[PDB]
Symmetry: C2
Subunit: 260 residues, 2 copies
């Protein structure tokens, strides 16, 4: 009737009883409901095929099975978009790991400022009738509930202004065979020199892209403006190319919703 | 340092690395932060000594170690008090288990209503039925993504479940076997409203009720409890409980429920 699934969040190693005939969406929505999470479009269940990132399909049946509950997509504006504390918390921990691992470049002042908010996010600080009265008074102060962790939001507001924040990088080659990087993020598609992940050479905002097409390892970005040339590029791995397109669709659509 | 702690919820398991010198409050607040839970006063970390329910102390150091994250206290009004969905969800699962186990008596009509809301709470949330790339393919994959990714709705069916459940006489009552000074075998009910004395052959309607606002004090000394009412016309109620671990639990539930009762009356 059910089988055990290990779900790893940034917080904990969790275990769920997944029904035999359940699809990816049923397992995913169980995890979300467990964490009281409604802002679910950011998240997915990740695993690795060979050495590539893979995200669990929501329409396929799920079949110690292990997935990582992670953000696939990032907000453009953390304060406006992360309304629930759980979403703020999960983003905070994922972004902080990327800061500490130096996956996101961070300048010295931002480093010490982020570190200070992380410190604040880490730390929140017989019976006689007379004993009954003392135990009444003591209980009120001891049981008032957790305050919302505003430091986590202050952290994300600094982090989101970093050039490398929420950018997915992929090694690519243009039609001349020049090695470059592709950045897929909230704002659009970006082409980088391989030795500068901070400042793109070219940017294609999602509103300025007529279409993207993919055939036989070649991507084509068709801009909305006919004065701007089409950008064709190559990526060698097919499993990586499927991931790029997944991130293009999601980020495009979340971009459009943010513009009402 | 650290040691592994298993935290079992109502339908999931989570493992945490608990620091050696950490107190119960450190471990408890880590679990609450993991679930994004701020309405924490309802909850505790439960374990069992011999066959009795025990709750982990927040000032004592924590020392496969397993605790159950459960509600120790119940709201008087679920809709008003369970503002966060997580709190609603955790109460829904705990109360549903008590309904299905028949720990809370439920009449047949309420039971089939509860079962219908449980179906809707299970899937209605995200499923309204309740259980190469060409430029043209790019356009189709854009349009398909919007409908496929809408977010989870607040699981309102759970609140509807709790609103039916909270009107059941046995809901949120902690029962304890007790004897009065004449030696009559009776039950003590500890709940959000006060203390209740039951005939053992009727857990639904109490013989005597002492509302928390109408209790001057409670005292306990060596197996015997004393309820002193506020009104001097009402006699003091003395009763006996045989098990010492059960008596520590009774007093814990008396203090918490008394204090939550008073906060609700501002």
């Amino acid at each position: 009737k059910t089988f055990t699934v290990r779900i790893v969040t940034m917080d904990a190693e969790m275990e769920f009883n997944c029904e035999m005939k359940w699809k990816g969406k049923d397992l995913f929505d169980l995890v979300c409901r467990t964490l009281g999470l409604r802002e679910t479009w950011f998240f997915g269940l990740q695993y690795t095929i060979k050495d590539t990132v893979a995200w669990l399909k929501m329409d396929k049946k799920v079949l110690p099975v292990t997935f990582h509950f992670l953000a696939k997509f990032y907000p453009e504006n953390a304060e406006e978009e992360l309304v629930q504390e759980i979403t703020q918390h999960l983003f905070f921990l994922q972004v902080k790991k990327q800061i500490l691992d130096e996956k996101i470049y961070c300048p010295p002042e931002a480093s010490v400022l982020l570190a200070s908010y992380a410190v604040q996010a880490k730390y929140g600080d017989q019976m006689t009738p007379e004993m009954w009265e003392e135990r009444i008074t003591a209980w009120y102060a001891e049981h008032r509930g957790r305050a919302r962790d505003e430091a986590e939001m202050e952290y994300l507001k600094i982090a989101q202004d970093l050039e490398m924040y929420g950018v997915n990088y992929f090694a690519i080659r243009n039609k001349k065979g020049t090695e470059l990087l592709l950045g897929v993020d909230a704002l659009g598609l970006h082409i980088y020199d391989p030795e500068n992940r901070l400042t793109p050479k070219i940017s294609f905002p999602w509103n300025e892209i007529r279409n993207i097409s993919y055939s036989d390892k070649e991507f084509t970005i068709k801009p909305l403006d006919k004065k701007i040339d089409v950008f064709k590029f190559n990526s060698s791995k097919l499993r990586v190319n499927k991931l790029i397109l997944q991130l293009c669709i999601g980020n495009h659509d979340l971009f459009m919703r943010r513009r009402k």
